[PDB]
Design a protein around this nucleic acid. Sequence first.
RNA 1: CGAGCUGGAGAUACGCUUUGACUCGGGGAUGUCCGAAUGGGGAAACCCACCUCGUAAGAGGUAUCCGCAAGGAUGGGAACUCAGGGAACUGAAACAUCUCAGUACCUGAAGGAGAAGAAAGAGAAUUCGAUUCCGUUAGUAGCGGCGAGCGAACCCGGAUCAGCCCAAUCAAGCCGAAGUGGCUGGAAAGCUACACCUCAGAAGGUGAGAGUCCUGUAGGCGAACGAGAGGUCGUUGUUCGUGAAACGAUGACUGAAUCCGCGCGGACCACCGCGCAAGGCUAAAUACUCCCAGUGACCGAUAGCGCAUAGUACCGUGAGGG
RNA 2: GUAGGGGAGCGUUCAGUCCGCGGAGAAGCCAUACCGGAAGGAGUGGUGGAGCCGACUGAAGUGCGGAUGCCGGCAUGAGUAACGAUAAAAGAAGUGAGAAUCUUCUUCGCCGUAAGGACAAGGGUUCCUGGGGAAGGGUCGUCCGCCCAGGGAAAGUCGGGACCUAAGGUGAGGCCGAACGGCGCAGCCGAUGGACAGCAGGUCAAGAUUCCUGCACCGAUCAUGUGGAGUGAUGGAGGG
Lengths: 93, 110, 66, 47, 72
Amino acid sequence: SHYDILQAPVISEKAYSAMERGVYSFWVSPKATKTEIKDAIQQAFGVRVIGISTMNVPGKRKRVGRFIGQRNDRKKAIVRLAEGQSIEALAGQ
Amino acid sequence: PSAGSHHNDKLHFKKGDTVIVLSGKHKGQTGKVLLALPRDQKVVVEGVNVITKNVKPSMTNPQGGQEQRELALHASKVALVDPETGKATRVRKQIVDGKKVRVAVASGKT
Amino acid sequence: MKPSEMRNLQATDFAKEIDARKKELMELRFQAAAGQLAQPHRVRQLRREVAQLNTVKAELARKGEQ
Amino acid sequence: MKRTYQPNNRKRAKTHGFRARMKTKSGRNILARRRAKGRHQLTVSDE
Amino acid sequence: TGKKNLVVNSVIRRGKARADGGVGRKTTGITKRVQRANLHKKAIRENGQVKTVWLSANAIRTLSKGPYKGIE
RNA sequence: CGAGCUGGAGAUACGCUUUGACUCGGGGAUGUCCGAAUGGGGAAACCCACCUCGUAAGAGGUAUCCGCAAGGAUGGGAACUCAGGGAACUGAAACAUCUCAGUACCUGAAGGAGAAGAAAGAGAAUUCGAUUCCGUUAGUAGCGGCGAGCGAACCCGGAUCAGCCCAAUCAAGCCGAAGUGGCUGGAAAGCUACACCUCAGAAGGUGAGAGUCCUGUAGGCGAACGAGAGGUCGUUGUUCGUGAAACGAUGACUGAAUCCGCGCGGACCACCGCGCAAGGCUAAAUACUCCCAGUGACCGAUAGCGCAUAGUACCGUGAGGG
RNA sequence: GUAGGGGAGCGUUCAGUCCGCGGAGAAGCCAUACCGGAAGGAGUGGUGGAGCCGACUGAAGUGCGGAUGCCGGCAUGAGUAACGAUAAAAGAAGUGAGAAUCUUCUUCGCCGUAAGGACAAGGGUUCCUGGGGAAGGGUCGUCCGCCCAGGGAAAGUCGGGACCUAAGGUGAGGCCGAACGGCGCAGCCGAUGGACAGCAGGUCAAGAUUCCUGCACCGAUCAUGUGGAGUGAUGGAGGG
Ligand SMILES: [Mg+2]
Ligand SMILES: [Mg+2]
Ligand SMILES: [Mg+2]
Ligand SMILES: [Mg+2]
Ligand SMILES: [Mg+2]
Ligand SMILES: [Mg+2]
Ligand SMILES: [Mg+2]
Ligand SMILES: [Mg+2]
Ligand SMILES: [Mg+2]
Ligand SMILES: [Mg+2]
Ligand SMILES: [Mg+2]
Ligand SMILES: [Mg+2]
Ligand SMILES: [Mg+2]
Ligand SMILES: [Mg+2]
Ligand SMILES: [Mg+2]
Ligand SMILES: [Mg+2]
Ligand SMILES: [Mg+2]
Ligand SMILES: [Mg+2]
Ligand SMILES: [Mg+2]
Ligand SMILES: [Mg+2]
Ligand SMILES: [Mg+2]
Ligand SMILES: [Mg+2]
Ligand SMILES: [Mg+2]
Ligand SMILES: [Mg+2]
Ligand SMILES: [Mg+2]
Ligand SMILES: [Mg+2]
Ligand SMILES: [Mg+2]
Ligand SMILES: [Mg+2]
Ligand SMILES: [Mg+2]
Ligand SMILES: [Mg+2]
Ligand SMILES: [Mg+2]
Ligand SMILES: [Mg+2]
Ligand SMILES: [Mg+2]
Ligand SMILES: [Mg+2]
Ligand SMILES: [Mg+2]
Ligand SMILES: [Mg+2]
């Protein structure tokens, strides 16, 4: 439900500075929709979301010994709020 | 092919129990049961002894170092004890109480 | 507990009970992939509790219908 | 000069795939007679 | 696919030269063996509600005598 | 079951469990998307919906045919069975009837088997008495460019038995006897001196070969749940290749008697015998073997399945090879 | 003495049975001048690490130099031929365990309707950062499109769908056909086409009519107004 969806947050130089801008970025759930993600974060973060984007990404097929395998493919999502409405739980990172 | 395979993955004894080494170099010695691995049918008695080198591994400890600790064993040179005799000592299974099951020798119990 | 603490409680609580169990499970995740998640168990345990909850509301809702 | 094999995704799939292979009898037959030989490669759908 | 009964089924075919003789000429030697098939015709009649369909010839008689379930 | 557990996996940290875990037997619940797919489309696993209830989050339904409904059918199954269809190479030292052979293959349907079945029959004794199966008769009677070659049945012995109706106990587990001393040895189970068990000396593990260490075996117990008509024309079937061609069998034409009647007895006739067509079901023995178990003058790493595992790597647009 | 028939036997395994050996060491392997008429078989020494010889009898996948035989390994040819366009390289500097080959610098040489740039089809992480150097690189490599780990891709207006139809593929009823099946009107699928609202600049190591800045456009639902009587399809025509 209004949580399950947000499978993680995104971690990198980029993500961090975007955060600094007031733009937050998570991995999500491939099957999901943008309306669904909006409803999601708007619900579990009490924020005004006015900006959104998503992008499905493959998964670095890697080998560990004679076992060529694909990783699970994710769906990076970016959201921009309004009026400097920074989110608390990640504001320390 | 597993070791408990032909031993119905069955541990005749238990974690705690004193034991005596039947066959081997450690013929007859006492040990509390510190580790009893049923499937592999392996088990640790405070006797055995061993000198192991734990290689470089910088963390923890830059240099290696060594270690006097002890190599496990096969529950088939493990022997339960008889409080009287204390030796090569089979087991019978009887009932004290009151649906509590137990364990005698030819003169119980343990 | 496993039997005595679920069947004593009513399902309109179960909905948001599920909900909160989720929420903590999620924050746990965020932690985990942020590091360090020093108590991995708590995750699987929360899973266990959830499965309990649903098994409960299920068997129950279908046994009250007798 | 120029070669036999010039890949075409739509061709490949609309030719050898699964909706395709099941559309005909002898393709059902190809299917299960493959399955029996324990193909991981069931069909070019499974690429 | 007649009225009563399906049909269409049949049949191979032979055929032989220096045939005919003093009951036995010397004898008959044969040349052939291949295969054929057989059929019927079309007719439009009734049952329960409204139908049209195929009908044989034997069926044509068997039905113009009287309704063996279906009618005209 | 009773002490360990946290899958192979062999890794750390997290933990769980004598209020009984883990593993085992037995039910339940949850089971995304694709696939008979089945709400509509689609390049399988993706796209777009409409309807009912919900506050939403959700949940249900939305294929087609037989049916009044209830309900049944669709797809899969290595072989085994039945059916519609039906090859050729080959052999006859050439070929065409013929043989390969109703074999290979295609297809339809169905089951744990199926098929067949309750006499217008075999038949030749005025005998047997539904079928399927095996033995046998028997390479006999016969078929055949009378060449290659093809090849019954009645009787006799067994397997298993049935004849009914309609239309005027195994599946989790528990419990189970009896040896120690010295010796060689890295290590005892082996050597040895004396021991005891046996309804138990089948086997496997243990530092090298153990009846008496372990797991077991003989034996004994053993669960709440769990499982037991005629005729004519073209043809064909049986050993049946137009041969004296009976009979069945159907494609096209014809379509009689119903008891003082009908059908057969290998052309055909009388006689004299065996028989009740036009309506259905039927266990049993029989076939197979994906799977489970037990065995072996079967293999042990070029063997044995293709594989100590993998239909994977690799080749192929594909079928397919491997 | 060839084809051939006959006679007696040697060895290999599996098997029944007895003699019996073996961690003070089995089989297998290695050396040798012993024995038997031969197939063969013994003695001892070195190997090895857990099984085996002998007699009698039984049953065979039972004895290989050949089959341009099959599998595998290793030789010859040979330190030969070749290192994949005759667009061409030098010196300095740096780094490193090691440099003709990797990184700076300054020149030289070649392409320049290309040997530049942007797309599509195809490929699939080859992109960027940091690292590695077994093998891939026709040499070398400290380097790489190879190895490891981590990051990177953002759209109401671009492109496709939520719209359309072509060829073609389908397709209830429909027309046929030993079976599987073959046709087939409407309807539906089908871009290579019709339709359609956004441009200019900025920047990550790595995205860009997406993100960010500046100023636009389109549909949708509600509200205050101008409302103040018509809205205009599953059919008509125009237009496309
Ligand atoms: Mg997008
Ligand atoms: Mg990689
Ligand atoms: Mg257990
Ligand atoms: Mg659920
Ligand atoms: Mg569908
Ligand atoms: Mg036929
Ligand atoms: Mg021929
Ligand atoms: Mg011939
Ligand atoms: Mg079927
Ligand atoms: Mg005739
Ligand atoms: Mg005939
Ligand atoms: Mg007849
Ligand atoms: Mg070998
Ligand atoms: Mg092999
Ligand atoms: Mg022997
Ligand atoms: Mg041997
Ligand atoms: Mg050779
Ligand atoms: Mg030559
Ligand atoms: Mg030279
Ligand atoms: Mg030369
Ligand atoms: Mg030379
Ligand atoms: Mg040269
Ligand atoms: Mg070159
Ligand atoms: Mg040059
Ligand atoms: Mg410089
Ligand atoms: Mg230096
Ligand atoms: Mg160069
Ligand atoms: Mg270019
Ligand atoms: Mg690069
Ligand atoms: Mg090199
Ligand atoms: Mg360096
Ligand atoms: Mg069609
Ligand atoms: Mg287009
Ligand atoms: Mg446009
Ligand atoms: Mg467009
Ligand atoms: Mg914009």
